[PDB]
């Protein structure tokens, strides 16, 4: 979209720790606009959380957020921030920033970022290729296994996105996140085609791109 609000910051924080999220303008913004922050705990509704007029730089907050959180703005950078202290497990959720023109609705939002709150520790994935078996089209994919806590799969650097099923992650008995990317492609492509599953991770810098062959 235009006036795209970009969001920065977001990851694992210690129960009671601090994380500064960020929301950049990247568009035409009236001086009077409010930036709001909006939460969504996993599998739950939207929760309004806070507002600022970057210009006069005065900020208001919901009771839940209290004076644990502080909303700030750099008018020189067109980048409004959310400073989180006191972090409980409650605060575990995606945070969207969003623009409101003072009319009382949000025209443009941000991509949203997970903030995950856990005394547990960032791990890395363990990509295991799922190889196939021409009964028409064929199913390949890869495990991305034993991770903590946001995972990003694609194929062929994002070019191929056709027939793909990147599954919800699952919480294992162990306590790690195991997903399962999957693609269905005409078998006439194997062995003919470069199939490589691009598994990124900000928490633990990771850019594994494993390859699939019978």
């Amino acid at each position: 979209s235009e006036v795209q609000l970009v969001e920065s910051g977001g990851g694992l924080v210690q129960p009671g720790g601090s994380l500064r999220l960020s929301c950049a303008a990247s568009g035409y913004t009236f001086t009077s606009d409010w930036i709001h922050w909006v939460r969504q705990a996993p599998g739950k509704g939207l929760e309004w959380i806070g507002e600022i007029i970057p210009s006069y730089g005065r900020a208001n907050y919901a009771d839940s957020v209290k004076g644990r959180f502080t909303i700030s703005a750099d008018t020189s950078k067109n980048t409004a921030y959310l400073q989180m202290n006191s972090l409980r497990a409650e605060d575990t959720a995606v945070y969207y920033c969003a623009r409101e023109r003072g009319d009382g609705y949000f025209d443009y939002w941000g991509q949203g970022t997970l903030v995950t709150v856990s005394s547990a520790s960032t791990k890395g994935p363990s990509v295991f290729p799922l190889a196939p078996s021409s009964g028409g089209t064929a199913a390949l994919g890869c495990l991305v296994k034993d991770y903590f806590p946001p995972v990003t799969v694609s194929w062929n650097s994002g070019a191929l996105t056709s027939g793909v099923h990147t599954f919800p992650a699952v919480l294992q008995s162990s306590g790690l996140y195991s997903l399962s990317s999957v693609v269905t492609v005409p078998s006439s492509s194997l062995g003919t085609q470069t199939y490589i599953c691009n598994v990124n991770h900000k928490p633990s810098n990771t850019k594994v791109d494993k390859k699939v062959e019978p």
Binding site: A131, S133, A139, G141, L143, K145, S178
Partner: peptide
Amino acid sequence: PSVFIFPPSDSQLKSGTASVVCLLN
């Protein structure tokens, strides 16, 4: 569903655990 089945990677089985995957498409 376009049912499929996936034996575990040579890679993984060195780890000492084995994951069997069943697609329903």
